[PDB]
RNA sequence: UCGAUGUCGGCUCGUCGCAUCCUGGGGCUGAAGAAGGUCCCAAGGGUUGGGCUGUUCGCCCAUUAAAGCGGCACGCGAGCU
RNA sequence: CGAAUGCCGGCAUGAGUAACGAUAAAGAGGGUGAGAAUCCCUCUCGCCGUAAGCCCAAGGGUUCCUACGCAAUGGUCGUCAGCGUAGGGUUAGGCGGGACCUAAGGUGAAGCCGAAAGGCGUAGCCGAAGGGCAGCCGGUUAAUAUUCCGGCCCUUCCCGCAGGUGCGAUGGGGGGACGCUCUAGGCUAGGGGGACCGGAGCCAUGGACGAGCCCGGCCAGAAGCGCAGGGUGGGAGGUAGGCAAAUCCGCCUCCCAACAAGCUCUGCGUGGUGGGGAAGCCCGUACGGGUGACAACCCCCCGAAGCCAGGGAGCCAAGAAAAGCCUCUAAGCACAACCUGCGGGAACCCGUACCGCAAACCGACACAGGUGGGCGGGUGCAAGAGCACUCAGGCGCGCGGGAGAACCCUCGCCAAGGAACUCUGCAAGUUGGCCCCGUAACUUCGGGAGAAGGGGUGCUCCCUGGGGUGAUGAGCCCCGGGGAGCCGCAGUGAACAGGCUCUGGCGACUGUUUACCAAAAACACAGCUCUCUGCGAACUCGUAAGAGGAGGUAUAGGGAGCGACGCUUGCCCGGUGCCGGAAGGUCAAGGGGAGGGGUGCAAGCCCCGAACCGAAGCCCCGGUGAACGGCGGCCGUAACUAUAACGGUCCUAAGGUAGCGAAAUUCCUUGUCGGGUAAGUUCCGACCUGCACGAAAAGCGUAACGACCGGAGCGCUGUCUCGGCGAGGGACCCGGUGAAAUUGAACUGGCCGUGAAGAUGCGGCCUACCCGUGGCAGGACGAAAAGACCCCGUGGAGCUUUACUGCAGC
RNA sequence: CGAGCUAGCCCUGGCCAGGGUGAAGCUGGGGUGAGACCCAGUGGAGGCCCGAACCGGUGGGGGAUGCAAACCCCUCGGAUG
RNA sequence: GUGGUUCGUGGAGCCAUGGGGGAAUCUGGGCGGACCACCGCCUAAGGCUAAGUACUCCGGGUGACCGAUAGCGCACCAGUA
RNA sequence: CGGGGGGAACCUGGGGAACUGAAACAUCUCAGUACCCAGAGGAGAGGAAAGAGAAAUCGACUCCCUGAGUAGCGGCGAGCG
RNA sequence: CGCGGGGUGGAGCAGCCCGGUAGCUCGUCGGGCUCAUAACCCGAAGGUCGUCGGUUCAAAUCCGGCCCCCGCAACCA
RNA sequence: CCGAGGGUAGGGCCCGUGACUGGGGCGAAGUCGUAACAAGGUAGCUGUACCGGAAGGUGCGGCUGGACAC
RNA sequence: GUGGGAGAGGGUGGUGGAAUUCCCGGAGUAGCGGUGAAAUGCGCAGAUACCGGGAGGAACGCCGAUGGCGAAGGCAGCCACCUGGUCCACCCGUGACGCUGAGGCGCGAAAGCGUGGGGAGCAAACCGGAUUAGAUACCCGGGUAGUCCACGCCCUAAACG
């Protein structure tokens, strides 16, 4: 039965993308947190 | 007037359709159309600010002329009468002799062969448009400017009209479709006659779906909700209103008058009994 | 017994008690006979099908030798409904 | 540290137990190899075939091809693989996207708003499965190909030559450019047939050397031409409109064509040319290669939902945009420029493997689930994408071998009976397609209707009608009609196809719903009523700007109730709500300064402060019921009796009208009577004593409708009397692999007692050799879940109001 | 931080085998003073009918450490709105 | 009307200021806790100013600090799988 | 010429909770904490008296000790200070 | 069992709260108007206040027990 | 082949009958009132509509078969 | 036929004044209404009575009759348009072409019904005041449908001479 993950490459980068994060002050601090944590990827990697 | 149907389905039983024989033209005048929103009843916040709207046939917006006075004294011929699906009434196509084409709300009795003009010059005749000050008292008239040069806001709906009851100073007294008596400025353009397609009110939608086609989605009553949703929500099965009947937002919906008390517009109104 | 002892009724499977419904054996009778009444012994076996209602009860139909009353977590849901 | 359903880890028990993931199915021979049910090859058998085949998009990301491997992954095995190592492999001016357009929306010079972060916003920009745009057929690789190659076509840019023209745009105009249903003519895709054409070869087992059987009989292709369609008038004058200007477009007039006439564009056909090209046989293939062949390469028929396409008609709910393109002019330039034709040159980036209804995507799994577009052949059955079988192609579902117990599942059949089963015909049966006859109450005249109930149904021969194609003909294809006969238990001979009637309740109807225990009598619904709202509307969202409402305007819009339709919808305005009321009462800040006070020597400075003027609100006066709501009590009375039309009296704002009524409502209740039944707590019809119906939280009805809920009959049955047999998949046995909750430890019997009140564990007595397998559930107060019920906690949350208090709003 | 599930709306596309019923209108004939209307043919309407795909999820059985954290079988509802 | 201070309206000054009114320039003005007098303090409505202060990504030194279930989440290719 | 963005914690400013405490709770508390935003910098803030406040006194600011859990504040409650 | 209200001339209601005094309508009785009846007019009679205790000087009135009547309630189970 | 009848199924008419229910007829002395016949004490009657224990009342319109004073 | 006439005959569209009602302005005070008598109602929040302004609906005084017209029902301010019946004079045409009329068709007062409008006065129902033994009546104060228009039904009558 249809489940929750219906991957679509444009939906991901439009939503969690790096330009998404930078546009909203909420999202900049996302990056800030993940960068301060040392996350290897600050943002979903979609191909 | 008002096509009926044999009941070869339920609801084709009581359904009733407009008589379209007034209509002389089907495709609208491409120069004169624009596309629509349409809003689903949602404002720029994405939020529904008007409940129970959506769906409904796609529509092209006929641009229509509510200032007749930019064209003063230039006559025009009535080319066609067609369906505007944004409004209760019908649109008349006017070829002016400038060669400019515009759409007008089609008054009751307007024929397409005929000539119409706007200005104080203006024979008092169906379709012509004048400053209110130059219409003879007792005339019935439609598409009225409420303030001068601001466009026609009054009596535009299928079958509506207003009468001139008299003049006082720079102002003239009108009886609006509501029956409010209010002063309108004499300088306000109006166009003699009633609106027509007045048979409009006897259409009988006849089945739910026909209501959808008009973009009206189902309407659910407060009684059918729960207390979170609505002052009428809850109870065990059925229930009187249990309080003075209210809107979902909580104000009383029987008799409570919402018009602002102090509006300057109040100096110009005498009525509505 | 609340860090759970699943509740009515039905179905299935029973088992026991006897304060015995039938069958067996008795005493008394206001027992002529046949048929009853009443009490005594007796638990071996037996104790119907159906209409109504979720019913248990109960009422009713057609029979019967009889259409017994109780207990078993009002027996029985790691057996079913 | 011994306990915290503690924490982390390790290892146990259950147990060699359940299970090994669709019941589409396997068998043998040969090969390989240390080793083979499982890998490869062949033969046989089975399964899919509107797929379980093929193509595309997503998503996935090397899984692709090949060599070498088998520790692990693979539910067994593995010599194999989507697995390990390594190597290779994805080729574009034309396909997709980008150096094009715009849609929702997004963003946003201007601008507006917001403590800050930010919000909005015209133009513009961005944004596509929409618009625009030039590649078709074949061959080739282990692996890519509209990408390479072959052949034949085309596009843009740049430059040039020639010829033509007032050239020129982001500006004006045209166009692009549009719905749903039905649908004409001509095509094509695809398909069937042929006695005609081409082809290895076959005569079996009784017959057949045959007009036999088997196989095949095409594809792409510029110009030109042909057929079929789309688009479209031409000329002149006037002109004030298309935010400058146009010669364009618009409009008025006049003048010819009236027609696709022509011009133009597209479809199909044909076309120089190029290319494919079966069975079978041979070899040899994970794959395909020789030959067949110098292959043939043709007639007829069926025929799209596709094409011509901006076709046609009808309808109402009235059906994107911008660019390409054309035209018009403005600057500007008229050596320029642009148009047309020819020629040369130039033509970038990204994708391109592979899976793709699934073992490669979403579901933790090689998971019976989910996933959008296209193609989807043949025959038969009325049609069809249905059903059965079958091409191409693809599969036998990654444990097997046996046995033939209980039991379970899924399936077949049954004497007689036929609902007696049971909450209930639950379930299963019956019925079942087409054609013909026929068909009630009632009805809103449509319906009810597939009502009901019947008959027909195959095959053969003879005769005969009309159609489409052709000619008006045969041939082929379609729809029929009549007559005589043949066989069987049976002719919709298999497969896919309603059981029906009577009668209540509720809801008018089709719809909607609690994803994952409720599909309904709930919601919605057309329709009726109330109410607000004059337009910078009310209302809603937002601090605001702004937006929705609406590019709407009272025949509109918002809120509320009621809920098709019929006939209807009574009385009460005391209370509450709302509506009206220019008086009156009260009323806050403020105005007013009577008088009083502090302190100074004082001028003064400072503090109280009565009257009186003073909003809304409340009070007060009215109104208002499809506003919240509410619509009586006791006693008497008629010439049998009973009852009480009548009366008395108390109270009220007013005392329930019509209709209906033991009801989805009736306690007593299985009310009483009648009907159905042999028997009826249900059901239907009545009565009225309505605990506790009643008129838009509408009253009473209503044809039609319903996977709703009740009651009855017929038909028919394994529901039952009442069980029996049979099939398969499991269960059992053997080989491979091998879990789980639970588990204080155990050397874990019965009765009668006792015990914290229900004892394997204490007393007494009885019984009892050790250990298992298959079975059944009575007990271990069995497992599971720190009981949801109940209470407790000055625990929590959702909801309400004439609880308190406050805030938005007004 | 989430509307890649789900709910509504917005923009742009696509899908719905086959069969059945036979509204209005049109045409002809009747009819009349002119009508209404009546019949026939034509036509091809509809939250019309049967039924695949597609969308559902009625009843029952199975499953219940599942194939599956909602599945399978049979049956059944809608299928131009 | 509020905030700040110990100051919750209190006898409530001081400092700050959203609203209304609104001066003067040494004989001017603010303050010493309502207010008045007196005696004092101080010169608002412009600005800058080292150091003594806080902190520890980084480098060092030192522990009656841990010693791979400890010590940072990470002694190990960890903000990884 | 300059700005933009980053920086563990520290700093200033703009804004600013609730659990909790009060053994219920509204004033009060938690707390100008958490957090969000803006700015600094290697620090930041503050700073040279229209100050204190009782002495005819002190003399910018910041930080420590003390004054002192004092003065006070307070449903004069918890508690704040 | 529970809680609230009641029992007063023949009927139906006051009075009880706040002790002393029993009232209203109807009915009944006597008289009148009328041929008569009713209507109508003029007069009258009629009561220990459910009961039994108690309190007080004094009880329909206050308190209690009993008896009736009406109403409400009986939930989770 | 036709065929008396038999059977299964669905209609039509007619009769009897049925809890209960509608009114009607009739019946020496029942209850409530007075609608009508005399201006019947509101002229009556009337088709229709609403209401009401009951006769009847009221509205609209009609008919006369109703009319010496002020 | 021709030439004439009378008429509220019918259908449509206009239009006038009187009056009632409501609203505004003015002025003005303590009652107005109403009946048998009263009361309900209305009125110092300014009623009634008076003057002026405005809105709207219905009906058409005098002429008017003991009249005219129509088949009946019915039809009445004024104007115009369309249109029916009918009478008279001349003796001009047709030549019995007539009369009645089961069925059929049409019209048919009031009230009533449906969908819309409109709603001033009146007014079933309904409320209240009074009368009365009662008064679901008669009188009085209120008052909805209706009365009016359009279209469509109903089709009755002391539809009577
Ligand atoms: Mg789906
Ligand atoms: Mg995509
Ligand atoms: Mg890295
Ligand atoms: Mg947004
Ligand atoms: Mg609506
Ligand atoms: Mg609704
Ligand atoms: Mg609900
Ligand atoms: Mg609420
Ligand atoms: Mg409620
Ligand atoms: Mg409810
Ligand atoms: Mg209820
Ligand atoms: Mg317990
Ligand atoms: Mg517990
Ligand atoms: Mg049981
Ligand atoms: Mg015995
Ligand atoms: Mg004997
Ligand atoms: Mg025995
Ligand atoms: Mg026994
Ligand atoms: Mg039963
Ligand atoms: Mg019983
Ligand atoms: Mg058990
Ligand atoms: Mg159970
Ligand atoms: Mg048990
Ligand atoms: Mg048990
Ligand atoms: Mg311990
Ligand atoms: Mg446990
Ligand atoms: Mg432990
Ligand atoms: Mg083991
Ligand atoms: Mg075991
Ligand atoms: Mg086993
Ligand atoms: Mg097994
Ligand atoms: Mg398997
Ligand atoms: Mg296998
Ligand atoms: Mg096939
Ligand atoms: Mg291996
Ligand atoms: Mg596996
Ligand atoms: Mg190429
Ligand atoms: Mg190419
Ligand atoms: Mg491209
Ligand atoms: Mg370029
Ligand atoms: Mg663009
Ligand atoms: Mg763009
Ligand atoms: Mg924005
Ligand atoms: Mg901004
Ligand atoms: Mg773009
Ligand atoms: Mg595109
Ligand atoms: Mg495209
Ligand atoms: Mg292209
Ligand atoms: Mg190719
Ligand atoms: Mg040009
Ligand atoms: Mg389009
Ligand atoms: Mg072709
Ligand atoms: Mg042979
Ligand atoms: Mg053909
Ligand atoms: Mg077209
Ligand atoms: Mg349509
Ligand atoms: Mg553009
Ligand atoms: Mg120039
Ligand atoms: Mg490729
Ligand atoms: Mg695969
Ligand atoms: Mg599938
Ligand atoms: Mg597919
Ligand atoms: Mg597998
Ligand atoms: Mg799968
Ligand atoms: Mg699918
Ligand atoms: Mg078929
Ligand atoms: Mg097959
Ligand atoms: Mg094959
Ligand atoms: Mg057999
Ligand atoms: Mg049998
Ligand atoms: Mg039978
Ligand atoms: Mg039943
Ligand atoms: Mg069934
Ligand atoms: Mg019948
Ligand atoms: Mg049949
Ligand atoms: Mg045969
Ligand atoms: Mg069959
Ligand atoms: Mg069948
Ligand atoms: Mg069927
Ligand atoms: Mg019932
Ligand atoms: Mg329904
Ligand atoms: Mg449907
Ligand atoms: Mg619902
Ligand atoms: Mg559900
Ligand atoms: Mg749920
Ligand atoms: Mg769920
Ligand atoms: Mg349903
Ligand atoms: Mg209705
Ligand atoms: Mg707001
Ligand atoms: Mg708009
Ligand atoms: Mg409802
Ligand atoms: Mg009231
Ligand atoms: Mg009120
Ligand atoms: Mg009142
Ligand atoms: Mg003074
Ligand atoms: Mg006031
Ligand atoms: Mg009512
Ligand atoms: Mg009543
Ligand atoms: Mg009853
Ligand atoms: Mg009964
Ligand atoms: Mg009841
Ligand atoms: Mg029942
Ligand atoms: Mg009944
Ligand atoms: Mg009810
Ligand atoms: Mg109601
Ligand atoms: Mg009913
Ligand atoms: Mg019904
Ligand atoms: Mg349905
Ligand atoms: Mg249903
Ligand atoms: Mg059986
Ligand atoms: Mg077997
Ligand atoms: Mg032992
Ligand atoms: Mg024991
Ligand atoms: Mg022991
Ligand atoms: Mg057991
Ligand atoms: Mg347990
Ligand atoms: Mg408490
Ligand atoms: Mg609490
Ligand atoms: Mg979604
Ligand atoms: Mg969505
Ligand atoms: Mg079809
Ligand atoms: Mg059809
Ligand atoms: Mg349908
Ligand atoms: Mg169907
Ligand atoms: Mg299901
Ligand atoms: Mg089940
Ligand atoms: Mg089970
Ligand atoms: Mg649609
Ligand atoms: Mg303060
Ligand atoms: Mg205080
Ligand atoms: Mg203070
Ligand atoms: Mg001071
Ligand atoms: Mg001074
Ligand atoms: Mg100061
Ligand atoms: Mg000081
Ligand atoms: Mg002082
Ligand atoms: Mg100082
Ligand atoms: Mg200074
Ligand atoms: Mg050490
Ligand atoms: Mg370690
Ligand atoms: Mg560690
Ligand atoms: Mg170690
Ligand atoms: Mg760690
Ligand atoms: Mg701050
Ligand atoms: Mg607390
Ligand atoms: Mg506490
Ligand atoms: Mg609490
Ligand atoms: Mg604080
Ligand atoms: Mg701060
Ligand atoms: Mg330094
Ligand atoms: Mg510093
Ligand atoms: Mg420093
Ligand atoms: Mg500073
Ligand atoms: Mg409760
Ligand atoms: Mg009378
Ligand atoms: Mg009389
Ligand atoms: Mg009389
Ligand atoms: Mg009356
Ligand atoms: Mg005649
Ligand atoms: Mg009539
Ligand atoms: Mg009438
Ligand atoms: Mg009288």
UniProtKB/Swiss-Prot annotation, chain A:
NCBIfam families: rpmH_bact. Part of the 50S ribosomal subunit. Found on the solvent side of the large subunit. InterPro entries: Ribosomal_bL34, Ribosomal_bL34_CS. GO terms for cellular component: ribonucleoprotein complex; ribosome. Belongs to the bacterial ribosomal protein bL34 family. It holds the Pfam family Ribosomal_L34. Residues 29-47 have a biased composition (Basic residues). One of its GO terms (molecular function) is structural constituent of ribosome. One of its GO terms (biological process) is translation. The gene is rpmH. This is Large ribosomal subunit protein bL34. The open reading frame (ORF) for this protein is entirely within the ORF for the RNase P protein (RnaP). The two start codons are separated by four nucleotides. Keywords: Ribonucleoprotein, Ribosomal protein. It comes from the Bacteria. Residues 26-47 are annotated as: Disordered. PANTHER family: LARGE RIBOSOMAL SUBUNIT PROTEIN BL34M, MITOCHONDRIAL RIBOSOMAL PROTEIN 34 FAMILY MEMBER.
Swiss-Prot record, chain B:
The keyword Ribonucleoprotein applies. One of its GO terms (molecular function) is transferase activity. Residues 256-273 have a biased composition (Basic residues). One of its GO terms (cellular component) is large ribosomal subunit. It comes from the Bacteria. Residues 222-273 are annotated as: Disordered. Keywords: Ribonucleoprotein, Ribosomal protein, RNA-binding, rRNA-binding. GO terms for biological process: cytoplasmic translation. Transmembrane segments: none annotated. InterPro entries: NA-bd_OB-fold (IPR012340), Rib_uL2_dom2 (IPR014722), Ribosomal_uL2 (IPR002171), Ribosomal_uL2_bac/org-type (IPR005880), Ribosomal_uL2_C (IPR022669), Ribosomal_uL2_CS (IPR022671), Ribosomal_uL2_dom3 (IPR014726), Ribosomal_uL2_RNA-bd_dom (IPR022666). Pfam families: Ribosomal_L2, Ribosomal_L2_C. Residues 229-239 have a biased composition (Basic and acidic residues). Belongs to the universal ribosomal protein uL2 family. Part of the 50S ribosomal subunit. Forms a bridge to the 30S subunit in the 70S ribosome, contacting the 16S rRNA. May also make transient contacts with protein S6 during translation in the 70S ribosome. One of the primary rRNA binding proteins. Required for association of the 30S and 50S subunits to form the 70S ribosome, for tRNA binding and peptide bond formation. It has been suggested to have peptidyltransferase activity; this is somewhat controversial. Makes several contacts with the 16S rRNA (forming bridge B7b) in the 70S ribosome. This is Large ribosomal subunit protein uL2. It comes from Thermus thermophilus (strain ATCC 27634 / DSM 579 / HB8).
């Amino acid at each position: 039965m249809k489940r929750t993950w219906q991957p679509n490459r444009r939906k991901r980068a439009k939503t969690h993308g790096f330009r998404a994060r930078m546009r909203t002050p909420g999202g900049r601090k996302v990056l800030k947190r993940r960068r301060q944590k040392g996350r290897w990827r600050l943002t979903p990697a979609v191909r | 007037a008002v096509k009926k149907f044999k009941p070869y389905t339920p609801s084709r039983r009581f359904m009733t359709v407009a008589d379209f024989s007034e209509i002389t033209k089907t495709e609208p005048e491409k120069s004169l159309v624009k596309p629509l929103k349409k809003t689903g009843g949602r404002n720029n916040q994405g939020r529904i600010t008007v409940r129970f709207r959506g769906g409904g046939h796609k529509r092209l917006y006929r641009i229509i002329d509510f200032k007749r006075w930019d064209k003063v004294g230039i006559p025009a011929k009535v080319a066609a009468i067609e369906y505007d699906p944004n409004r209760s009434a019908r649109i008349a196509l006017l070829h002016y002799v400038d060669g400019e084409k515009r759409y007008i709300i089609a008054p009751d009795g307007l024929q397409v062969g005929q000539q119409v003009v706007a200005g104080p010059d203006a024979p008092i005749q169906v379709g012509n448009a004048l400053p209110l000050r130059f219409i003879p008292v007792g005339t019935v008239v439609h598409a009225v400017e409420l303030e001068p040069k601001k466009g026609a806001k009054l009596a535009r709906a299928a079958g509506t009209s207003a009468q001139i009851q008299g003049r006082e100073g720079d102002y003239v007294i009108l009886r609006l479709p509501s029956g409010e008596l209010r002063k309108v400025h004499g300088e306000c353009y109006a166009t003699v006659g009633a609106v027509g397609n007045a048979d409009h009110k006897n259409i009988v939608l006849g089945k739910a779906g026909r209501s959808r086609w008009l973009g009206r989605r189902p309407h659910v009553r407060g009684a059918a909700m729960n207390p979170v949703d609505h002052p009428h929500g809850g109870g065990e099965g059925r229930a009187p209103r249990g309080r003075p009947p209210a809107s979902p937002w909580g104000w009383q919906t029987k008799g409570l008058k919402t018009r602002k008390r102090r509006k300057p517009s109040s100096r110009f109104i005498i009525a509505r009994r």
